[PDB]
Scaffold this active site. Sequence first.
Site, short mmCIF file in Angstrom:
data_model
loop_
_atom_site.label_atom_id
_atom_site.label_comp_id
_atom_site.label_asym_id
_atom_site.label_seq_id
_atom_site.Cartn_x
_atom_site.Cartn_y
_atom_site.Cartn_z
CG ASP A 160 5.77 -8.16 6.41
OD1 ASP A 160 5.95 -7.03 6.40
OD2 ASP A 160 4.51 -8.42 5.67
CB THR A 198 -2.74 -12.28 8.74
OG1 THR A 198 -1.93 -11.55 8.28
CG2 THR A 198 -3.96 -13.06 7.79
CE1 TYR A 226 14.34 -12.57 -5.98
CE2 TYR A 226 16.24 -13.44 -6.78
CZ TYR A 226 15.19 -13.37 -6.98
OH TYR A 226 14.31 -13.79 -8.24
CB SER A 244 -0.95 -0.07 1.15
OG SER A 244 -1.92 -0.89 1.09
CG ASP A 286 1.31 -10.39 9.69
OD1 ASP A 286 0.56 -11.43 9.77
OD2 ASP A 286 1.24 -9.53 8.94
CE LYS A 288 0.76 -12.52 5.98
NZ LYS A 288 -0.53 -11.60 5.62
CG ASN A 348 4.86 -12.33 6.19
OD1 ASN A 348 4.70 -11.81 4.95
ND2 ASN A 348 3.99 -11.94 7.17
#
Length: 282
Positions: free
Chosen positions: A147, A169, A85, A16, A129, A131, A134
């Site tokens: 994340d 989440t 990466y 976002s 978070d 999950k 991630n």
Amino acid sequence: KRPEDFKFGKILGEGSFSTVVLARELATSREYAIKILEKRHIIKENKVPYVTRERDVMSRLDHPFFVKLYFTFQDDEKLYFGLSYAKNGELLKYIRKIGSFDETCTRFYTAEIVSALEYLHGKGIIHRDLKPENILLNEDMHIQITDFGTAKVLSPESKQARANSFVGTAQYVSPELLTEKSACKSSDLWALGCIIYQLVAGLPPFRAGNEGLIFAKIIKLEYDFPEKFFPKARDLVEKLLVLDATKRLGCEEMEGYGPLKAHPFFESVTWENLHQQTPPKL
Ligand SMILES: c1ccc(Cn2cc(-c3c[nH]c4ncccc34)nn2)cc1
């Protein structure tokens, strides 16, 4: 470093207020996933806390199963974070593709997540978070956890145990965050339980067409196991998906990671050199 120091390639993720883009550093030829944030946007949306927090948390991480922050730089309009990466994408991609992991694969990747959480919790940090989306896979198919924007550093000085922001989440959120309105290290162990269940079952344990319905089931511990669920995995999940956060295998009150790593599901696991072992083929 400057943006001109890199050649940018494909977009690896769109958020976002931020974007992650593949980049090659010209002077060295190394590849990075660079997270880019618009400085004007952050101020306007008051996302600075999420950004300053993330830098400090990632600066503390130095473990093979976590994304590393190599560098940060800025220009008049943007912030850049140079990250590891991970070429092989999200764990979720594989769960969806294969449907469900066999026992050897479930055990191996669960062990890597457990090893990662042992390190993270040792540093006094809660991801908040966790999950499959991630949990990335690098070129060698070992996990890389990312994340950290929602992550919290708990203060050693006050022996802090609780974090108050509501983040996460829905499918993986812990009951204590819903009822007590705060999270702890043990909240990540709840998420681990959901993830193990998902690797075997194909879907997370608490699922519904909207968040409110999911929350209702979490608070009541309303879920079932599918037939054929590996028995020792089922036992482990039942020891993690426990409403009382002080009673989850692995939590401080239950005396930490040793008892968790000792669970019978992990009996064949060699923990020391996990990140150098060859992953089982999925
Ligand atoms: C904006 C904020 C957060 C995200 C999710 N995300 C991906 C990553 C990431 C780090 N290294 C990677 N390597 C490959 C693909 C994705 C990543 N970190 N966070 C994407 C866009």
